[PDB]
């Protein structure tokens, strides 16, 4: 339920989203 | 070379320059705004290599009406590169293409 605001990539954990987001 | 590469990898080839085409009227590359304000200068190419698709296609906020998008990232570096666009009506031409973000590619466009 967690969507990257930059790319639209969807994640099932908030922690996954945080790591991915900060790679942008 | 002939090629556009993943910027992070530097030498992972994503597409070749002959694959660039004008889907829009503004040209092969234009700036688009995503639903959170982020600007992506998106280059349309018929074909891209070395990308992993994430999830399933979606029409929400599609910059190209009649096409749905699927997130695409480098198979080597997992960097975000762009999106695969797939037609939702059988008459769209083409039926698929890729939008690659300028900031993710080398050489620097
Ligand atoms: O055609 C496209 C490609 C996808 C792009 N996009 C995003 O970057 C994004 C981020 C978060 C939620 C939703 C989206 C979305 O649709 C966008 O806005 N339009
Ligand atoms: Zn992202
Ligand atoms: Zn890469």
Numbering used by the authors:
A (entry chain B): 409 to 432
B (entry chain A): 318 to 426
What is written in the article reporting this PDB entry?
The direct target of thalidomide and related IMiDs was identified as cereblon (CRBN), which was initially reported as the gene associated with inherited autosomal recessive mental retardation. Among them, SALL4 is a C2H2 ZF-type neosubstrate for CRL4CRBN involved in embryonic limb development with a strong genetic link to embryopathies. To elucidate the SALL4–CRBN interaction mediated by the (S)-enantiomers of 5HT and thalidomide, we determined the high-resolution crystal structures of the ternary complexes (1.80 and 1.90 Å, respectively) by using the thalidomide-binding domain (TBD) of human CRBN (residues 318‒426 in which C366 is mutated to Ser for the crystallization) and human SALL4 ZF2 (residues 410‒432). On the other hand, SALL4 ZF2 shows a typical structure of C2H2 ZF domains consisting of a β-hairpin (β1′ and β2′) and an α-helix (α1′), which are connected through Zn2+ binding with the conserved CXXC and HXXXH motifs (C412, C415, H428, and H432).
The (S)-enantiomers of 5HT and thalidomide are located on the interface between SALL4 ZF2 and the CRBN TBD with the same orientation. The backbone structure of (S)-5HT completely overlaps with (S)-thalidomide in the SALL4–CRBN complex. The glutarimide moiety is enveloped in the twisted β-sheet of the CRBN TBD and forms van der Waals contacts with three Trp residues (W380, W386, and W400). In the complex structures, the H378 side chain is positioned in close proximity to the phthalimide moiety of (S)-5HT and (S)-thalidomide, but far from that of pomalidomide. In the (S)-thalidomide-bound SALL4–CRBN complex, the phthalimide moiety moves farther from the neosubstrate-free state towards the endo direction to avoid steric hindrance caused by the β-hairpin loop in SALL4 ZF2 and the β3–β4 loop in the CRBN TBD, conformation of which seems to be fixed upon contact with SALL4 ZF2. Therefore, the favorable SALL4–CRBN interaction mediated by the (S)-enantiomer of 5HT or thalidomide can be defined by its binding preference for SALL4 and CRBN. Besides, in the (S)-thalidomide-mediated complex, there is no hydrogen-bonding network involving R418. In contrast, the KD values of (S)-thalidomide were almost the same toward the wild type (4.00 ± 0.36 μM) and H353A mutant (4.43 ± 0.16 μM) of the CRBN TBD. In addition, the effect of (S)-thalidomide on the SALL4–CRBN interaction was not largely changed by the H353A mutation.
